[PDB]
C-alpha cells in the first residue's frame, strides 16, 4: 500500500501508535511509519552502539513483529507485521 493509501490498524498495532502519541483511528502508511519510529525512539528500543538494530524483545512491539530484534536495513519483519495489522480503507 503506497498511493497515500488510507488504513485502519488492528487493535494491537493501534495501541502502540497511541502510546507514540497518535490521536487517530485512520492513517496513511507514511503516518504509521512515522509513529512506529516515534515509538522506538521514545522507548529507546534501538541499540545504543549500533543504532540500525532495534531490540524489541519484551516489548509489545516484539509481540507484533514476532522477532526479538531487527535491522532497519532489513525491514521485512516490519512490512510483514503491517500486512497482518493494517485494514485498507
Amino acid at each position: 500500500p503506497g498511493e497515500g493509501t488510507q488504513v485502519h490498524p488492528r487493535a494491537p498495532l493501534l495501541q502502540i501508535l497511541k502510546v507514540a502519541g497518535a490521536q487517530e483511528e485512520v492513517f496513511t502508511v507514511k503516518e504509521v511509519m512515522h509513529y512506529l519510529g516515534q515509538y522506538i525512539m521514545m522507548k529507546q528500543l534501538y541499540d545504543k552502539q549500533r543504532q540500525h538494530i532495534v531490540h524489541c524483545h519484551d516489548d509489545p512491539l516484539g509481540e507484533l513483529l514476532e522477532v526479538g530484534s531487527f535491522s532497519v536495513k532489513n525491514p521485512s519483519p516490519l512490512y510483514e507485521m503491517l500486512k497482518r495489522n493494517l485494514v485498507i480503507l
Partner: peptide
C-alpha cells in the same frame, strides 16, 4: 549513525 537518521531512510 543515529536511529532517527536511519529510520528516515526507510524505503
Amino acid at each position: 549513525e543515529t536511529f532517527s537518521d536511519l529510520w528516515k531512510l526507510l524505503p
